[PDB]
Amino acid sequence: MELHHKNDIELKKYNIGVAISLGNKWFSIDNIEKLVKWSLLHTKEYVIIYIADSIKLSDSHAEEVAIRYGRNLFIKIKERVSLSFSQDEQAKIIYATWSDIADSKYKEKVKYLYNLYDKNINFKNYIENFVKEWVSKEKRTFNNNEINKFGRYILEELPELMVQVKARGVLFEAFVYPYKTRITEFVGLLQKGEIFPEIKTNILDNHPKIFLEVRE
Protein backbone atom coordinates (compact mmCIF):
# COMPACT_ATOMS: atom_id res chain seq x y z
CA MET A 1 0.00 0.00 0.00
CA GLU A 2 2.09 2.90 -1.33
CA LEU A 3 1.47 6.13 -3.19
CA HIS A 4 1.05 6.15 -6.98
CA HIS A 5 5.94 17.00 -5.73
CA LYS A 6 6.93 13.43 -4.97
CA ASN A 7 9.19 14.79 -2.21
CA ASP A 8 6.33 16.62 -0.48
CA ILE A 9 4.73 13.48 0.96
CA GLU A 10 8.15 12.19 2.04
CA LEU A 11 8.65 15.62 3.63
CA LYS A 12 5.27 15.10 5.39
CA LYS A 13 4.12 18.67 4.78
CA TYR A 14 0.40 17.82 4.50
CA ASN A 15 -2.33 16.54 6.77
CA ILE A 16 -4.08 13.61 5.06
CA GLY A 17 -7.81 12.93 4.75
CA VAL A 18 -9.13 9.42 4.14
CA ALA A 19 -12.08 9.78 1.79
CA ILE A 20 -14.42 6.80 2.19
CA SER A 21 -16.95 5.79 -0.50
CA LEU A 22 -19.75 4.16 1.48
CA GLY A 23 -20.99 0.98 -0.15
CA ASN A 24 -18.05 0.80 -2.56
CA LYS A 25 -16.77 -2.78 -2.43
CA TRP A 26 -13.11 -1.71 -2.18
CA PHE A 27 -13.69 0.16 1.10
CA SER A 28 -13.73 -2.86 3.36
CA ILE A 29 -12.58 -2.42 6.96
CA ASP A 30 -9.23 -3.94 6.05
CA ASN A 31 -8.61 -1.53 3.16
CA ILE A 32 -9.82 1.41 5.23
CA GLU A 33 -7.41 0.26 7.94
CA LYS A 34 -4.54 0.11 5.45
CA LEU A 35 -5.41 3.59 4.19
CA VAL A 36 -5.28 4.82 7.77
CA LYS A 37 -1.93 3.08 8.32
CA TRP A 38 -0.47 4.78 5.23
CA SER A 39 -1.83 8.19 6.21
CA LEU A 40 -0.56 8.02 9.80
CA LEU A 41 2.95 7.43 8.44
CA HIS A 42 3.03 10.13 5.76
CA THR A 43 0.96 12.87 7.40
CA LYS A 44 2.06 16.22 8.73
CA GLU A 45 0.20 15.63 11.99
CA TYR A 46 -3.46 14.65 11.69
CA VAL A 47 -5.38 12.07 9.68
CA ILE A 48 -9.02 12.90 8.93
CA ILE A 49 -11.53 10.10 8.24
CA TYR A 50 -14.72 11.17 6.46
CA ILE A 51 -17.45 10.06 4.07
CA ALA A 52 -16.79 11.37 0.56
CA ASP A 53 -19.69 10.35 -1.69
CA SER A 54 -22.63 7.95 -1.63
CA ILE A 55 -23.00 6.33 -5.07
CA LYS A 56 -36.16 11.21 4.02
CA LEU A 57 -35.03 12.04 7.54
CA SER A 58 -33.10 15.09 6.44
CA ASP A 59 -33.16 17.71 3.75
CA SER A 60 -29.54 16.80 2.96
CA HIS A 61 -28.57 13.53 1.30
CA ALA A 62 -25.06 13.46 2.77
CA GLU A 63 -26.51 14.18 6.22
CA GLU A 64 -28.98 11.34 5.59
CA VAL A 65 -26.18 8.93 4.68
CA ALA A 66 -24.16 10.03 7.73
CA ILE A 67 -26.95 9.19 10.14
CA ARG A 68 -28.31 6.06 8.46
CA TYR A 69 -24.92 4.39 7.83
CA GLY A 70 -21.92 6.67 8.42
CA ARG A 71 -22.36 6.43 12.17
CA ASN A 72 -22.20 2.63 12.26
CA LEU A 73 -19.33 2.59 9.80
CA PHE A 74 -17.39 5.01 12.01
CA ILE A 75 -18.08 2.77 15.01
CA LYS A 76 -16.68 -0.33 13.29
CA ILE A 77 -13.69 1.75 12.20
CA LYS A 78 -12.97 2.95 15.76
CA GLU A 79 -13.15 -0.64 17.03
CA ARG A 80 -10.65 -1.87 14.42
CA VAL A 81 -8.36 1.11 15.07
CA SER A 82 -8.35 0.53 18.82
CA LEU A 83 -7.01 -2.99 18.15
CA SER A 84 -4.56 -2.26 15.33
CA PHE A 85 -2.87 1.01 16.46
CA SER A 86 -1.24 2.33 19.60
CA GLN A 87 -2.69 4.99 21.88
CA ASP A 88 -0.34 7.67 20.49
CA GLU A 89 -1.43 6.86 16.93
CA GLN A 90 -5.13 6.99 17.77
CA ALA A 91 -4.85 10.51 19.16
CA LYS A 92 -3.91 11.72 15.65
CA ILE A 93 -7.13 10.47 14.03
CA ILE A 94 -10.23 12.67 13.69
CA TYR A 95 -13.63 11.25 12.71
CA ALA A 96 -15.36 13.93 10.61
CA THR A 97 -19.06 13.61 9.91
CA TRP A 98 -20.94 15.62 7.32
CA SER A 99 -21.89 18.27 9.92
CA ASP A 100 -18.22 18.85 10.87
CA ILE A 101 -17.46 19.65 7.23
CA ALA A 102 -20.59 21.44 6.02
CA ASP A 103 -20.35 24.59 8.12
CA SER A 104 -21.70 27.95 6.98
CA LYS A 105 -18.87 28.76 4.57
CA TYR A 106 -19.14 25.31 2.98
CA LYS A 107 -22.92 25.52 2.47
CA GLU A 108 -22.42 28.78 0.59
CA LYS A 109 -20.38 26.94 -2.07
CA VAL A 110 -23.00 24.18 -2.32
CA LYS A 111 -25.82 26.69 -2.75
CA TYR A 112 -23.81 28.31 -5.53
CA LEU A 113 -23.66 24.94 -7.28
CA TYR A 114 -27.41 24.39 -6.73
CA ASN A 115 -28.04 27.81 -8.29
CA LEU A 116 -25.87 26.99 -11.30
CA TYR A 117 -27.62 23.60 -11.63
CA ASP A 118 -31.05 25.16 -12.19
CA LYS A 119 -30.12 28.35 -14.09
CA ASN A 120 -27.53 26.85 -16.48
CA ILE A 121 -28.81 23.97 -18.57
CA ASN A 122 -25.35 22.94 -19.80
CA PHE A 123 -24.11 22.50 -16.25
CA LYS A 124 -27.27 20.57 -15.35
CA ASN A 125 -26.98 18.50 -18.54
CA TYR A 126 -23.34 17.68 -17.88
CA ILE A 127 -23.94 16.85 -14.20
CA GLU A 128 -26.92 14.69 -15.21
CA ASN A 129 -24.81 12.73 -17.71
CA PHE A 130 -22.41 11.91 -14.87
CA VAL A 131 -25.20 10.09 -13.06
CA LYS A 132 -26.43 8.35 -16.22
CA GLU A 133 -22.99 6.80 -16.74
CA TRP A 134 -22.87 5.46 -13.17
CA VAL A 135 -26.33 3.95 -13.62
CA SER A 136 -25.28 2.18 -16.83
CA LYS A 137 -22.62 0.30 -14.87
CA GLU A 138 -25.48 -1.15 -12.81
CA LYS A 139 -28.10 -3.69 -13.83
CA ARG A 140 -30.63 -1.19 -12.43
CA THR A 141 -32.42 1.59 -14.30
CA PHE A 142 -33.46 5.07 -13.21
CA ASN A 143 -35.95 7.64 -14.47
CA ASN A 144 -35.11 11.22 -15.39
CA ASN A 145 -36.53 12.55 -12.12
CA GLU A 146 -34.27 10.17 -10.20
CA ILE A 147 -31.27 10.92 -12.41
CA ASN A 148 -31.84 14.61 -11.66
CA LYS A 149 -32.26 13.95 -7.93
CA PHE A 150 -28.91 12.16 -7.75
CA GLY A 151 -27.12 14.91 -9.70
CA ARG A 152 -27.94 17.44 -6.98
CA TYR A 153 -26.42 15.00 -4.47
CA ILE A 154 -23.01 15.20 -6.22
CA LEU A 155 -23.01 19.02 -5.94
CA GLU A 156 -23.25 18.65 -2.16
CA GLU A 157 -19.93 16.80 -2.02
CA LEU A 158 -18.29 18.66 -4.92
CA PRO A 159 -16.77 21.52 -2.82
CA GLU A 160 -15.08 19.19 -0.34
CA LEU A 161 -13.28 17.44 -3.24
CA MET A 162 -12.10 20.68 -4.82
CA VAL A 163 -11.30 23.05 -1.96
CA GLN A 164 -9.33 22.71 1.27
CA VAL A 165 -11.86 22.59 4.11
CA LYS A 166 -11.54 22.45 7.86
CA ALA A 167 -13.06 19.64 9.86
CA ARG A 168 -13.32 19.99 13.64
CA GLY A 169 -10.99 22.98 13.24
CA VAL A 170 -8.41 21.19 11.07
CA LEU A 171 -7.56 22.13 7.50
CA PHE A 172 -6.55 19.03 5.52
CA GLU A 173 -4.82 19.85 2.25
CA ALA A 174 -4.59 16.31 0.84
CA PHE A 175 -6.73 13.20 0.66
CA VAL A 176 -5.97 9.60 -0.21
CA TYR A 177 -8.06 7.58 -2.60
CA PRO A 178 -7.12 4.26 -4.22
CA TYR A 179 -8.04 4.98 -7.88
CA LYS A 180 -8.80 7.78 -10.31
CA THR A 181 -12.52 8.10 -11.03
CA ARG A 182 -14.63 10.15 -13.41
CA ILE A 183 -15.11 12.36 -10.35
CA THR A 184 -11.42 13.05 -9.71
CA GLU A 185 -10.94 13.80 -13.43
CA PHE A 186 -13.83 16.28 -13.38
CA VAL A 187 -12.51 17.95 -10.21
CA GLY A 188 -9.09 18.31 -11.85
CA LEU A 189 -10.61 20.13 -14.82
CA LEU A 190 -12.63 22.34 -12.47
CA GLN A 191 -9.60 23.28 -10.35
CA LYS A 192 -7.70 24.21 -13.52
CA GLY A 193 -10.76 26.07 -14.79
CA GLU A 194 -10.67 23.92 -17.91
CA ILE A 195 -14.36 23.16 -17.45
CA PHE A 196 -17.20 25.44 -16.19
CA PRO A 197 -14.75 28.24 -15.31
CA GLU A 198 -17.38 30.20 -13.38
CA ILE A 199 -16.98 27.52 -10.70
CA LYS A 200 -13.31 28.34 -10.21
CA THR A 201 -14.02 32.07 -10.36
CA ASN A 202 -16.67 31.72 -7.66
CA ILE A 203 -15.97 29.00 -5.10
CA LEU A 204 -12.25 28.23 -5.53
CA ASP A 205 -9.41 30.17 -3.98
CA ASN A 206 -6.29 28.61 -5.57
CA HIS A 207 -6.07 26.40 -2.44
CA PRO A 208 -6.80 23.11 -4.27
CA LYS A 209 -7.21 19.78 -2.52
CA ILE A 210 -4.25 17.52 -3.31
CA PHE A 211 -5.36 14.06 -4.49
CA LEU A 212 -3.01 11.22 -3.43
CA GLU A 213 -3.55 7.94 -5.26
CA VAL A 214 -2.72 5.26 -2.71
CA ARG A 215 -3.42 1.56 -3.15
CA GLU A 216 -1.73 -1.82 -2.83
Residue numbers in the entry: 1 to 4, 10 to 60, 70 to 230
Give the authors' words:
Cyclodipeptide synthases (CDPSs) use aminoacylated tRNA (aa-tRNA) substrates to form peptide bonds between two amino acids yielding a cyclic dipeptide product (CDP). ParaCDPS from Parabacteroides sp. 20_3 (GenBank: EFK64745.1) produces cyclo(His-Phe)8 whilst ParcuCDPS from Parcubacteria bacterium RAAC4_OD1_1 (GenBank: ETB63777.1) can synthesise both cyclo(His-Glu) and cyclo(His-Pro)9. ParcuCDPS belongs to the XYP sub-group of the CDPS family, characterised by the presence of 3 residues: X40 where X is a non-conserved residue, Y202, and P203 (numbering respective to AlbC). ParcuCDPS displays a Rossman-fold common throughout the CDPS family.
